[model samples]
Target chain A: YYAAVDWGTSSFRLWIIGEDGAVLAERRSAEGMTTAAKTGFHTILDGHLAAVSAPAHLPIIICGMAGARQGWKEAGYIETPAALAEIAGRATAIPDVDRDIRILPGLAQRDRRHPDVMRGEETQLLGAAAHLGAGSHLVCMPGTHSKWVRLADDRVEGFSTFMTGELFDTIARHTILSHAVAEADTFAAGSAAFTDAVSRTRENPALATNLLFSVRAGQLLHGTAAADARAQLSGTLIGLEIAGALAGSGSVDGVCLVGSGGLGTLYRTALESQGLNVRAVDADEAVRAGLSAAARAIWPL
Target chain B: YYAAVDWGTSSFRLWIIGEDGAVLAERRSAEGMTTAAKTFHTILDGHLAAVSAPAHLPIIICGMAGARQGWKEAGYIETPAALAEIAGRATAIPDVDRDIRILPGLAQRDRRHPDVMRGEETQLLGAAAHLGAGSHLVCMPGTHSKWVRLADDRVEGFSTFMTGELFDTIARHTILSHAVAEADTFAAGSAAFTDAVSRTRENPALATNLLFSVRAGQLLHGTAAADARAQLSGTLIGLEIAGALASVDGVCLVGSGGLGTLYRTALESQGLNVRAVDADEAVRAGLSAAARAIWPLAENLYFQ
Candidate 1:
């Protein structure tokens, strides 16, 4: 069995994987980045392992913000167009742990055109490449800070970061758009208004210029139709996203969305509308697979 | 002589007028609407009378946020079609002051169309009418909530409240506009952009919809230059005002543009501009003229 941990900004998740790469057992901690600072990195790891009843001596690999400056050990590696093994390097084994513990090296791109640094998504790209043999792939991991990762031959070449999700949250909740939409349990994504807005925004990409007004316009001009306003606002934001992504790269052969299930579905549907072949990969599963790969490579029996 | 007080949201000013409506002396206080609890009227009168050494017996008239609920009393009056003494009926006289005091009434209109409210601008409109005669006039008032008053004898009115001063402060000091432009710096008007935005807002009446996109589009598309963006935004807002004002009975006339001179200039330069002339009188002079007309029986009143 291989031990894998996907440590994110605010949470820590662990999965025990079998030889076949299926999850054997899983554990999670609310004591994520915020609380982990006090006791230091080793204490955090020890607490998590103890809770999960992880064996004393087992090959382990980790991913996510844990490799950041304040976290455990920083494993810095060069950018994409390099294999997963090459990017990860010989996983830096921790001295304290009796069992093999490998901290995955983050992927970095530094050249003239575009310069970016990503920590956890490299592992996800490796897993994606392994699952779907990669020649040239675009991996979209959507979150507060969504990243569009480009890969070649199990190597992350480069990536661009768009703060789309966080921006949406800020605009919807904090900005003036909040006045246009009332709290609803669920919004129907396939409604006519939704499609209409998407099409409208797609046609006049510059219409993103008037996104906030679109929300208020519906209420002020056309009576306060909450449902339609919400859909249209969503369309405008997503439309802007589509426009931004297209501008980033002319076109891509295939697009794989790696994110939460809900976000993944939305992105996939939106991408498909633009005639792009898109697929969704469970972010948790991808991280698990990546961690397992790193564990096996770093701690060979 | 009639004493006039221009009491606004954040400041108070009292004018001591001669019988000819000339300002003998003026006293101002920072104790405006924002700082007062409920007795701003008393505070204003007490402070101003002390400074001007007036006998506290002049017929004191007030305007602006003094009509709101939190003030001494509500002087709610419907906006009449023509600039008349219709605003006098809603005046609330407080028992504290033993002088003839009238809080000028605000105007309101609600047809099967749009609606608006005007308080102090009615006096400004009165002044514009007196100065311009029966000509088309545009009055632009400066300060926080800037308004463009349109008059054609009959206040065939539409006004725009461009929070320009507020925007300047927030954009420059605060991180809202992200240090995009410095404060108090003038942005030249782009007539083409203004025209385009005016047409867009007029056609669809979507002022709010286009506001955010102006920022985003400027950042992303690189189409709108900074000055053009500011002008476009102002024009969009002005367009909304134009659409609402067009429904009123007479030809469009603009007035009270003291604060929004640049915006007024921008609108005037554009071929589609509506404002005919600028009202040069200060709010104090306008208020004095209005007081002289309303209380004609009391004195060496200036009614020119």
Candidate 2:
């Protein structure tokens, strides 16, 4: 028996797995790295473990910001052109804990021009790697900071991080477009506004910023609704991200989308609109699968 | 003497011109369209009394104070429009004893790409005289930078890029805020600024990536706040220029202050020729042209 935890910046999730790999129980909370650092990582981990009546002797595998330098224990990073299996080996164990607990290290790209770092997404890539029987593939992991990793077999070649979700949040809340999208109802991926924006921006990626302004301008000139305005805003940024990620890269047959829920659906629609074959994998399943892989390797199940 | 005012969304400027078109007195305040809406007559009287202008002096106004929700409603003049026709379409303020006219803005009625401009049309009406006859790509840089295509005296089409506003929002509201907070200003020639412009021009699609790099660069290389701020500015400005120049070749910058100089430098660095004009003088000149066209003062009233 074992317990796996994916601790992120603002959220926490844990799953209890039986010896046969069946899900026993699960726990989730807002007590991620930011909160855990202050309230005690051991205390939170113990509370979640007890909530599920997890066995005291069960070995635990952890991933994400819990391994950050500012986190419970710095799991550090493994350099790029790296194999996914190396992640399990580089796990940093939590000192003074009775249970066998190991936090996974992140991945770092040291290129002077494109220096980037990823914590939990690398694990998601590892989990998603199993399903992607690969010659070469571009794995798209969407989030506040979206990651596009060029994975060959099981090794990461290089990747890029686009601040798409973050930009959408700030632009919607901080800029003049806030008024345009304030009263917006939830827009769907099938919305014409969303698809049209994707098609337009895909043709002219340089006009991304101008397209953002068009949301406000369209509201003033064409009486654009709040939902469509929101859709256009979302579509513009997603399209920009896809354009940048595909820039100068070799052709790929399809894309592996490790995303979930509404955000994943948006990306899937945008990618499909751009004519890329998308193979969808839930982010929750991928992280859990990733933690499961690390547990098997380290504990020798 | 007559009065000319450029009452924008958040700024108000009033000028008293004599028979010779000299600025006899001037007043400026933060009481623009928003605040002046409630105190339109009061604000106008206060500025006029401060300048000791005559009660019957006719007034000409431009900018947001002429919006539908402003002091008075001034409708728009659709494009393929002539510069000379703008003055003829000025809307007179009702119930006021003094003659007050608000200039209508310019509207591009294309269903595919719709846009509108209020104050800048007046700026162009004045700057066009200096531009002379020819097809010109005009850039009016501000919170929302405007790029206009003008041929001879007729306006063709235009676009509004949210460049300056994006920079302000990103610098204050995004993760890059802390990275750029200590910096007050960055020069037009800053290596960080120019380098960012060149990078974006090379591959405009990588713009948001370049924006993320600002924070990453700070984290990886310990980049100074000044450089970070400059990179953010250059990235936004560069993207704007790349989009604006997509269909055109060269540009005429109708701008003022440090923003103008920065755009000029960015334009020139990109190997594009640019003709510069002072925005303040352009607006004042525009108001004077409309004034002479409307109120026929027998004496000469050239713009100062």
Candidate 3:
């Protein structure tokens, strides 16, 4: 039996997998990096391990903020490109844990172009590679923070983190846009107004500065419906993201999106509209696969 | 009886006074201009009337956000010399309410200089003039966003709004200044450090850009202590205000102290100190006198 853990900033998920990597059982915990007062990293693992009994020598692989400075152990490995196999060679083997466990190292690239460090997205890229197989592609992970990642072979070459989530929250709560956009309308992600916003963002990147005003302007001047403002704002952010990502590294051959089901669907639909072949996958599934890959590599029987 | 109200952006205060110009009662409310949703102007009077009962036709005088576009009817009066009265002769008296009222207008030396407006500070200055007549003074009002008002007979001038409260919130909650200084320490007002910061700010305009780096450099280098950094920042802002306020007409003369004490010292150390009085007394007396000026007939009745 193999165990894979996708320990993120706010939650933790553990998957017990068979030799063939089929999930046998799973456990989840709300213990994330933010909750613990002093000892969050260890508490997360202890809470999850107590849920299901595994062998003393169970091969487990961990990802996400688990490798952050505040996490259990710092995985100090340099950026690796190519495949997960190539990157796995640089994975740090943490010592002195009560149980035998290996933490997966995150990928880093073009450190100078933008100082970005990712812990969990690398796993998603590896999973994308396993499904799509060896080639250059872009993987967009949308969340509170959206990351646009580049991959050559199976390794994540470089990525950029955008303040999409924070911006959305700020515009919705702090700005005039709050009045126009319905609070409960966040769920309708792929509305035509959203798509149009993304396209407009791509056309005019500078619109990000005046994007919030446009929401009010749209409602006042153009008679753009109020409910559609939320979708339009989302589209503006996503659109700006596409424009920025493309500007940074030109066009990608294709795009794969890894996120929650709803968010992934929105991203895939948006990418498809822009004439890019898009594949969508559940973030949890990719996380499990990446964790399993780490487990197998750490304890090759 | 008469009442003076200084309804500002974030808070409101009403002073009840006898016709003899003595404060009978004082009331404060959190319903300032910033938080009032929808009808911003009405919130001030609503909050004031909620706290205290007054005579049916008492003379009411107001200042600050009350004159804003949506607030009390705009008191479109211009800047007058220190202590010079510029009352909005017409009042926007509420229909159901009965009283002759006036909102004091703000004064600006020119479009280029800092503008001086009083919601309460005018009353404070009027109080200062009544309490410590002929005293040169400065008044510093503390709030989440704070400002320093310089004056002689009337409020001569004031300067920019610094996000002091916002800074405190960010410093404590955000990892930026997490361990630097205790909030209580700031509440008491660190005159020593505030003066230092004020001096630094008065040095040059280029100093303004260095404000952000104080946080970054302190985090990275650990050279400047947190308290010192906080003071340095406050000084930068205060000094900028000092420089801006100086550009307006009239020399720094007599003014209220209290909250303005540290700021006055900071100004003095920079060779820009003005004459001053205690702010609490000044605001009270100012409110009392303004009330009396509006209703001279009530004078003998109340004083009796």
Candidate 4:
């Protein structure tokens, strides 16, 4: 039996996998690196294991921010063109722990022009790699810092981090667009306004901010609805992300979108709208599979 | 002599113009519309008394104090508006001790792109004469920067680009502020600015990404404070210029002090023939011009 833990920046996930390679028990909480970093990583882990009745000798494998600089133990980054299997090769050991607790290293694109680092997404990529084997796969993982990676075979060539989610947040709360979206509730994700802005901003790309102003202008002049206003904001940012992702040396024909829920659905809609093929995967599943892969590599199963 | 008040959003400038159209006295303060709205009568009364004006002196006012939500309701005059019609369209404030008049602002009431301006229209009224007879592009740089297109002393249409506000908010609140925080506005001289301007102008939709790159570039390259500050300024200003000048060729850059200098350098570098006009003096002159037209000095002179 093994305990696979996905300790991200703002959330924590745990699963008890039997020797039969199936999840026996699972737990999820907000005790991520941000919370556990102070409360103690092992403290949180011990409590969770106790709650789930995890065996004392259950080997634990962790992937994500727990391997970061300010995490449990600083797991140094594995630089690209790094092979997928090589990620498990560099797992850092937590000395003096009763159980064999291992934290997988993250991936770093050490290029001078587009220097980027990813912690948790590397694990998902590791699992998705098996499904998208032996070919060029342009992958999308949407979050605070959305990563668009170019992978050839099982080796990652490079990637760019677009501040899509974070920028959307800052724009909605910080910029003048705040008023435009303040009273609005969650808008319909499939509106024509959303797709139109996606296509137009994707085409022009230059008049991005100007279009943002037009939202307020549209309100004062044309009486734009709150939902449409929200839609425009989302579309402009998403379109900009697409433009940047495609602007690189990465392939634009097909994308392997690794995400779940609304983010994954939104990315899939955007890709299909542009007439691109998409292969979507559940991020939670991918991460679990990744930690399991690392577990198997560490301990002979 | 009559009082000419250029009472804008956060700035107040009053000039006591004599019958000969010469400045008799002046008062400048930060008690603009937002401040005076509460103590409306007292502030004006205090300013008039300080200038040693006559007891029964009439006043001519322009700018935000005349908006519907302002001190007195001075309505907007719709556009494709003739510049000459502005002065005669003054709205009067009734029941005041003296004959206090407020100038109506110009509005571009287009169906899709609705834009309005209060004080800058008066600046155009002052600047339009000097620009001569032609299809002229007017530019005013400020927090809410305005660009107006005019032909033969009449404003055809205009757009207000939120360039300045976006720059201020983005720089102060965004991730880019880490590097940009250390430098002053004098950082415009850095070559990083011009290059950023060119790159953004060439491909604008990638603005947010470019903004992200500025932070990433800083994180990796150890970018200097001045250079980071310069690039952010140039990128924003560059995107603004591209958007405003998207449907036009050249412009008359109306601005004042520091921003004007940087704007002029930016415009010229973008290969536009810019006619620089001091926006501060232009607005004051505009108020004076509106005042003179609203009350002909010749009629008041005989009474004086």
Candidate 5:
């Protein structure tokens, strides 16, 4: 049995697997890299381990921001055209600790024109890719920085990161559209306002800023509801992301969405709405599976 | 002398015109609509008193001061409306000793692309009279940049892109903030600026992706803050220009300052012919035209 962790910038999750590869215990917290950086990472890990009653010398595998440059230990990055199975071999071990702890390295695309990096999502991609089989797949991992990877079999050719979620948050909270979307309720994925925005933005991604202003204009002119206003903002950003992701890649038969919860549902709806088939993978499970693969490879248990 | 004020959302500019149509005095302040809401009377009166203008000098105002939330609600004149007709729709500030009138703004009632402009309409009214009447696309750069399609004196349509606001918010709020924090200022002619403009103009669909490249460029290339900022500005401005000219072309730039120069430089780089007008002068001229039409100011000046 071993422990696995998905340590992100603002979130942390852990799970202990039994000898049979079934879950033994689990833990989740907001005590991510941002918090663990100040409070010792070992201290945080020990506390969570005690709560789950993890064995004294239980081997552990970690993926995400914990391996970042400013993290507990920099696990560094693997350049692209990278192989998913090879990620396990590159795990960096934490020194001075009695128990074994390894943090997986991230992936970096050093293309001068499109320099990009990803820390945590690479693990999710590793786990999710197992079920994807042999095919040319466009993997969509949606988050604060939505990453769209072009995967041919086990190899990651290249990827692009869209500032979709962050842009949505900032635009809603800081821009003039704030008033229009101030008291918005959580809008459903099936909303006409949401779908319509996705379609219109896909039609002409250039008018994105213009469409953003129309949210306020819609409020003044059409008396748009706060919920619909919020949905429009979300849909417009998602649509722009889709358009950009598909720009030079030509046509795709389907997309693999490695995401979970409401965010996953939103992306699934968005991708399917664009007439592309979507295969959903639970991100939580994917990260754990990724960590498990690394743990097994290192310990040979 | 007569008073002409262009009171915007965040700025205030007042000018006193002599009987010969020459400017006698001027006042500018940060006390715009947002700040002047509570001190509207105090601010306006103080500016007037500072200039020592007579109480009989009729005042003509434009911009956000005339909104529902502003001092007085001078409603909008829906589009396809003529520039000449704007002065007629001015709303009076009642119970005041002096005759104070605020010009109405222009609104596009299109259901799909609904848009509104308060201050730039006045600039357009002034800038329009100078350009010979053929189809002209007037570009007005501001916090809320406006692009108007004009045929003769009538405003056919207009679209507002949140270009400037987006640049600011993205810089201050997003991860890109760190990339641009050290930048004090960036020139319009910077290669980083023009190159980013060219890229976005070529494929505006990849705008957000291009925006992310700013941060990536910083991380990989050790990009200077000034260059990163210029690239960001260029990307947004490029997107705005692409959208505005999506349907048609040819631009008459009605703006001022580094922003206007940037727009002019950007437009010229795109091989689009542009005619430039000083926005500050345009607003004053617009108010002067309205003053001439509403009052006996022209005759008073002629008989001077």
Candidate 6:
């Protein structure tokens, strides 16, 4: 059995790929690039591989931030309009290592005005493309830096990143909005306040912060609920993202949400509310599929 | 001779006015409401003594420390109130050595968007009386910028923009902090600030994306610290000015200092021509007016 690992900025996910691409063993933890940097990437990788009781000298294919400039070894970037096959073709191998190890390059959109770089989502996009087939697509992969990619046929086009999650994180931790969202543990999936905020911000995208301020004022004057505050904050940021993402992208079949769980549901509700259909894919499955594609290419039967 | 104080959330200013409306002495410090909540009487007494204020003399005050949660429980006055009535609505402190009166704040009880302002209304009260207005739009730029519309020096309506506070919080708290860390002071006439203000006003909906762009802009373009600083500040200030003047036909900028300079430049870029007034002088005049109206002793009793 070989290994396929998705080493993100703050997470470590590993899957043991057996004969015929069937998963034999799997491991996931918070020991991503940031931690692995201190504990040693090779050491952490070895510990995980042995815990799963894999064969000696099992080659591993890696993706995500592990290939970044500050990662174990820089895997570099593949320019847009490049083929998915090339992502596999440019698989970077590590030297001075006992076992075979390769990391995939990220995708870089080097436009002067909208320069963007994505690490793990590219692999997810690659995996989704196989199931999506020939059509121009807008893929939504939500995260700290939520990405929306534009794909044409099998070739990569361009993409944009909205600091949606990070913005929400800092806002909740540091702003007056904290008090508004303090009592909320979580909000409902199809909350009316959530959907309503999304629609309002989408309609009048400029009043984003003003609406955020209203959360506090609304609480003081109208007694808005904590759950509603939580929902409003999330919906507002998401709505702003949708507005910016679809700003100039004419019309499409529908948005392909390459995510999982709660974010997936939220994005689904948001998109459908905007009158657009959604094609949802499990993010973890997509990552494994991309790693599997890379592994099969490097060591084919 | 008496004392006049302007106490806010995080600042304290005290001025001594003698007979014939002449300034005697003054004191300024960070002993505002937050700190005063712990040591209110002590801070007030120390300031009065430092100014060598007379024992029998009274005092008049304005701002947040008079809030329900402050040194004295002063209430709020509902709008569209007459500016002249604000001083008359002042609340007096009981069992004090001398007369120390705290003024009430103004509230816009209009539904859908109820608003409030404390210190600046007094500044407006003073600035308005001096301007002798026909139809005016007063722009008071600060931590929470206030805009008041007036007809014949009477405040008709107003709105508060969380521009300054939000800008500080975002710059200090968000990912944009890294981009703006190396930022220097925004200069006398920064093109970066002016250009960003005009761009945002034109595309206010893109404000959020525009904020994110500052990070990307710095990453890709290596936007200078000063320039990045200007952009972040300019975007927020631009949105505020755009919102405040959305329905207005003109402006009267009643602000002072470097902040005033930045706003003035940005406003000018938006094709705005404003009449500028000193905020320090305006607030002092407001306190004095309130003092004389309440006491009527600065020129009458104190002199005799």
Instruction: Identify the leading candidate in terms of lDDT.
Output: 5
Tens-place lDDT per residue, model 6, B1-304, is 6688889877899888876678788898988787888866788888777766777688888898777568777777877888888888889887456887888887766544556778987897778867775888888888777888887757787777777777877788787898887665868586888877987777665566677777777765678888888888998888777666554546789898888988888888888887899987888889888888877752455555
Tell me the spans in candidate 3 whose CA falls farther than 4 Å from its real position. A36-50, A80-83, A109-113, A185-187, A217-226, A251-253, B1-32, B36-304
List TM-score per model, in order: 0.58, 0.93, 0.56, 0.87, 0.96, 0.90
Residue A90, candidate 1: Cα error in Å is 6.4
lDDT of 2 by residue, A144-237 (tens): 9999998987899888889999999999998878988989868989998998898887778888777888888788778999999999999999
Q: Give the range where candidate 1 chain A is weakest over 10 consecutive residues by summed lDDT.
A: A205-214
B1-304 per-residue lDDT for model 4 (tens digits):
6888888877888888777777888898998787777776788889988988997788888898887558887877789999778888888877457888888887777754567788788888887888788898887887677878889889898877777777777678776788788776655566788888887787675666667777767765688877777777787788887777664546888998888888888887788888888886777678777776766655655575
DockQ scores of the candidates? 0.07, 0.68, 0.03, 0.43, 0.81, 0.38
Q: What local lDDT does model 4 show for residue B86? A: 84
Residue lDDT tens for model 6, A213-260: 666656655678999888988888888788877886787658889989
Over the true interface residues, superposed, what is the Cα RMSD of model 3? Answer: 12.2
lDDT, each prediction = 0.56, 0.87, 0.57, 0.81, 0.88, 0.81
Candidate 6: which stretches are off by over 4 Å? A81-84, A251-253, B31-39, B55-59, B66-73, B92-95, B109-111, B245-249, B298-304
Candidate 4 positional error at A102, Å: 3.8
DockQ top scorer: 5
**Model 4 residue A7 CA deviation in Å:** 3.1
- Evaluated at residue A112, the lDDT of candidate 6 is 61
Sorted into a CAPRI-style docking class, model 2 comes out as medium
Error of 6 at A268 (Å): 2.9
* Candidate 2, pairs of clashing residues: none
**Candidate 3 residue-wise lDDT, B1-304, digit = tens:** 6666666556667766664556667777776655654454466456456657553636465554554433555453444444446342436555455574656555454432324454544544455444444433343444322233444555444443332433343344333353355433343255536644554444322231223334334433443454544554464445445434433322233334334654565555555545555544555555555555555663355555
Worst 10 residues of 4 chain B by lDDT: B295-304
Against the true structure, whose TM-score is highest?
Answer: 5
- Candidate 6 at A1: error in angstroms? 4.6
Put down candidate 1 lDDT per residue, A26-120, tens digits, no spaces: 88877666567756767877776787787887567888777766677766655555677774564566776587777777765554223345778
- Model 1 reproduced share of reference interface contacts: 0.00
Clashing pairs in 5: none
Whichever of 2 and 5 has more DockQ, that candidate is: 5
Task: State each model's TM-score restricted to chain B.
Answer: 0.67, 0.93, 0.69, 0.89, 0.95, 0.94
